[PDB]
Scaffold this active site. Sequence first.
Site, PDB file in Angstrom:
ATOM      1  CG  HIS A   5       7.962   4.800  -8.253  1.00 13.46           C
ATOM      2  ND1 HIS A   5       6.850   4.125  -7.796  1.00 13.46           N
ATOM      3  CD2 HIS A   5       8.446   5.490  -7.192  1.00 13.46           C
ATOM      4  CE1 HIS A   5       6.685   4.374  -6.508  1.00 13.46           C
ATOM      5  NE2 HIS A   5       7.643   5.196  -6.115  1.00 13.46           N
ATOM      6  CB  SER A  62       4.441   7.462   6.775  1.00 11.98           C
ATOM      7  OG  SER A  62       3.103   7.525   6.329  1.00 11.98           O
ATOM      8  CG  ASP A  89      -7.651   1.688   8.581  1.00  9.51           C
ATOM      9  OD1 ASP A  89      -8.707   1.394   7.995  1.00  9.51           O
ATOM     10  OD2 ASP A  89      -6.614   2.049   7.981  1.00  9.51           O
ATOM     11  NE  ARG A 138      -1.759  10.282  -9.451  1.00 13.64           N
ATOM     12  CZ  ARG A 138      -1.434  11.565  -9.349  1.00 13.64           C
ATOM     13  NH1 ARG A 138      -0.356  12.026  -9.972  1.00 13.64           N
ATOM     14  NH2 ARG A 138      -2.187  12.388  -8.628  1.00 13.64           N
ATOM     15  NE  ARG A 177       4.712   6.405  -9.496  1.00 15.49           N
ATOM     16  CZ  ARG A 177       3.631   6.759  -8.805  1.00 15.49           C
ATOM     17  NH1 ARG A 177       2.436   6.275  -9.129  1.00 15.49           N
ATOM     18  NH2 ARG A 177       3.742   7.614  -7.791  1.00 15.49           N
ATOM     19  CB  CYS A 182       9.201   5.775  -0.721  1.00 17.40           C
ATOM     20  SG  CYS A 182       8.427   6.258  -2.286  1.00 17.40           S
ATOM     21  CB  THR A 183      11.534   9.036  -4.183  1.00 15.89           C
ATOM     22  OG1 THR A 183      10.552   8.203  -4.818  1.00 15.89           O
ATOM     23  CG2 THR A 183      12.605   9.355  -5.184  1.00 15.89           C
ATOM     24  NE  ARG A 236       1.150  -2.493  -0.621  1.00 16.98           N
ATOM     25  CZ  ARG A 236       1.099  -3.757  -0.190  1.00 16.98           C
ATOM     26  NH1 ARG A 236      -0.034  -4.298   0.272  1.00 16.98           N
ATOM     27  NH2 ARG A 236       2.208  -4.486  -0.207  1.00 16.98           N
ATOM     28  CB  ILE A 237       3.166   2.942   5.098  1.00 21.53           C
ATOM     29  CG1 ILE A 237       3.796   3.346   3.766  1.00 21.53           C
ATOM     30  CG2 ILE A 237       4.085   3.340   6.266  1.00 21.53           C
ATOM     31  CD1 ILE A 237       3.866   4.871   3.574  1.00 21.53           C
TER      32      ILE A 237
HETATM   33 MG   LIG Z   1       0.196   3.574   2.823  1.00 25.84          MG
END
Ligand SMILES: [Mg+2]
Length: 333
Positions: free
Chosen positions: A177, A119, A33, A197, A233, A150-151, A11-12
Site C-alpha cells: 500500500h 467515505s 471545510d 506510523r 506501507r 478503499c481496500t 484528498r477524497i
Molecule cells: Mg481524504
Amino acid sequence: MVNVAINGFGRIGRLALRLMINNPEFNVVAINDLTDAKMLAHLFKYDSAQGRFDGEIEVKEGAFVVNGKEIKVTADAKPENLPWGELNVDIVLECTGFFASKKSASAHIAAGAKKVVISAPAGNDLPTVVYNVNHDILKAEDTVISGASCTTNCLAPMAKVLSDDFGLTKGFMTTIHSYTNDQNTLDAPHRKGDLRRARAAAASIIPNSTGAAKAIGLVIPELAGKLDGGAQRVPTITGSLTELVCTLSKKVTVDEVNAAMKAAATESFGYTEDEIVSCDIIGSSFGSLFDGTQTKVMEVNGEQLVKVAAWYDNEMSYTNQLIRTLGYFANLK
Ligand SMILES: [Mg+2]
C-alpha cells in the site's frame, strides 16, 4: 440532476469534485471545510499524485468557480449548522473522517440533506456498499450509508468471484500500500501512539494493521469472519496492490481462476494480463483491476492453496466507487 454537498475537501473530497464537475448529472452546490479557501483551491489545482486539474478554478468570497460552475464554500465544524435544506442538497459526501458513524453523520440530515454517503467504514448498523458488488441492498428509505474502505473496494469483487464460483473457505490478505498522510515525514512522535506510523514514510517497508478483510462480511455476508489480513506501507505516493492467499471448496487451475475474474469484469472491476506496475493504476476509473499475471495455484497431497492479486489507486479508484454509489443512491425512488 442530483444536488451534492462535499463535507471535507481532503484528498477524497478534491478528487470527488474532479470526477463530478463535468458530469451534468451532478450539481455540486457546496463544499464545507475549515481550511482557508486559498489553500484549498491551490491543493485542488495542483496534485502531486494525480497531476494538474484539467480545468479552471477561481476563488471568490465564500465560493469557488470551477469550470464555470459556482460552488459555495462554507467552514462550519458542526454539520447540523450547514445550510443543506436551503441549498436543496440531495446527498452529502461525508469525507472529513470525523463523522464515521450513522448517528454522527445523520447531523447532515438534520441540516436538510436527504441522504449521506460516508467515505469510510462506519460501523455495522448501516448499509455498507461496494458498487457493483452489493449496491442492490440499498433502499429509497435508507438515509446514511458507508462506501466501505478503499481496500474493501479492491478486495470485494475478487473475493465475491472466489466465493460464488469456487466456495472460498478462508483467506489472508496482504495489501502492499502507498504511504498515507497519517504517516510521519521524518521519525517523530505519532499522535495515535503508533510506533510504525511514527517512522519516516518514504524510507521503509512499514507494516500496518488493516480492517478491510476482517470486515468483509458487511459487503459479502457469506464471507463474514472468513478473511483476515494486513498491510505493508511502502514508498509510493499512491497506487496499491491487494494480494489474497486462500483455500477454496473446489479444485481449480490458474486459467480457470483468471477466466472467472474476466467473466465478472465491470466498470468497477477490470481485468488485465498486461505486466503493469503500481504507477500504471494511478488515476484508474476501476475500483479494482484484477491482474491475471499474478494468479498462482499450488497443490500438495491433493489440497490446494490459491494466490491472486488486484491493483487499485487507493485514491482515485475508491473515489470512482464513491461517486457511482452516490449517484445510484440519490436516484433511488
Ligand atoms: Mg481524504
